[PDB]
């Protein structure tokens, strides 16, 4: 939309909204991220701290799949199953705990951010946190591991 | 889903539920009054003092 723009209301106005004392000249402070350590030092030090210099070890050939570990919390754990399972698990009197395979849902590790509703459950995860495990012992459950 | 179900505010604003819980209209217009100098104008001075 060229009608709604600012240009259309600078027609008549001399400088086209770029000043009279200092003009609209081409590149009056260099191009791109230039002058970083010299005449744009304050902008870089103030809004982009730690930009210049080296930190840590170089890992030449890095494959992102070996370090693949998507997390779920106990908050959203009962949502990988139906509401049917949770309801019928309390409705059953035998003490049978429904089995939540976490890797079927597409999470490897279980973290322990969440409050858990009070019924027994088994969790077939690839990894477990300490507080994550303790909370499922606290509710009265199991932590089966997956290879 | 609709953002308001019943879009007939003709019916709504005169319906007894709403009209019950209103305050009376202030429908009388008060234009400016010309200031008459009551030191010259006797009756206006009597209207004040």
């Amino acid at each position: 939309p060229s009608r709604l723009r600012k240009t259309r209301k600078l027609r008549g106005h001399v400088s086209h909204g770029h000043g009279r004392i200092g003009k609209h000249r081409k590149h009056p402070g260099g191009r791109g991220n230039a002058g970083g350590m010299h005449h744009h030092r304050i902008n870089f030090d103030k809004y982009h701290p730690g930009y210049f210099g080296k930190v840590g070890m170089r890992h030449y050939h890095l494959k992102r799949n070996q370090s693949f570990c998507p997390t779920v919390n106990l908050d959203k754990l009962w949502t990988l199953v139906s509401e049917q399972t949770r309801v019928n698990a309390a409705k059953n009197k035998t003490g049978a705990a429904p089995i939540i395979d976490v890797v079927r849902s597409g999470y490897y590790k279980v973290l322990g951010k969440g409050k858990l509703p009070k019924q027994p459950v088994i969790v077939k995860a690839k990894f477990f946190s300490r507080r994550a495990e303790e909370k499922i012992k606290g509710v009265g459950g199991a932590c089966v591991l997956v290879a | 889903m609709h953002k308001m179900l019943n879009t007939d505010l003709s019916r709504i604003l005169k319906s007894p539920e709403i009209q019950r819980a209103l305050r009376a209209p202030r429908k009388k217009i008060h234009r400016r009054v010309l200031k008459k100098n009551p030191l010259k104008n006797l009756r206006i001075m009597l209207k004040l003092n």
């Binding site: 809004y47 799949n65 705990a97 088994i122 591991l145 | -």
Partner: protein
């Protein structure tokens, strides 16, 4: 020159990029020509499946993906061997063949052997001279009821097991899964010099 707080950008446009802009006005004519060539082929190989041959079941490598299943390239020779199909007959009756595939496991094998037994049962085979049949061919009942197949032949879907709600054992609740992880990590790390010091001992 930077104004205020804002992201520090590095646009890759320092070369003669305007000469090598590739614009996609081809796209709806490219889709039409592909759909044309597709239907042309599907009519050419007339009663044979439109997708072409049957691809085998294959696990994705790399831990990120190995919980999935794809279509593989072609059936290993030691899957054809134990299924009882010749590697030079297989390709002529519509079975993809890969001469590079190894078989580390026997379940990866046995799934693909039962894949070929189902395929060789489903397959209708026409006479090479249509008036005089041969032994390994189909019955004229099935030959008149034979039809062009749409989409990938015996398609590969990804099904998981059903685990019924069980009562949690007194040991199963007792097992320390976090401590097991942590002490499996240290047994993997320190093992090498635990063998060294025990050798020097």
């Amino acid at each position: 020159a930077p104004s205020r707080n804002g992201m520090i950008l590095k646009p890759h446009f320092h070369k003669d990029w305007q000469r090598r802009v590739a614009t996609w006005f081809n796209q709806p004519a490219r889709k039409i020509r592909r759909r044309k060539a597709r239907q042309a082929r599907a009519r050419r190989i007339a009663p044979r499946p439109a997708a072409g041959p049957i691809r085998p079941i294959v696990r994705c490598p790399t831990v990120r993906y190995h919980t999935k299943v794809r279509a593989g390239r072609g059936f290993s020779l030691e899957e054809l061997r134990v299924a009882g199909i010749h590697k030079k007959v297989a390709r002529t009756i519509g079975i993809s063949v890969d001469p590079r595939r190894r078989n580390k496991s026997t379940e990866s094998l046995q799934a693909n052997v039962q894949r070929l037994k189902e395929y060789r049962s489903k397959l209708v085979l026409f006479p090479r001279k249509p008036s005089a049949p041969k032994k390994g061919d189909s019955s004229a009942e099935e030959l008149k009821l034979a039809t062009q197949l749409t989409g990938p032949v015996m398609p590969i879907r990804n099904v998981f097991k059903k685990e019924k709600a069980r009562v949690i054992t007194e040991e199963e609740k007792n097992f320390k899964a976090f401590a097991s992880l942590r002490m499996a990590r240290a047994n993997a790390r320190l093992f090498g010099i635990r063998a060294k010091r025990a050798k020097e001992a």
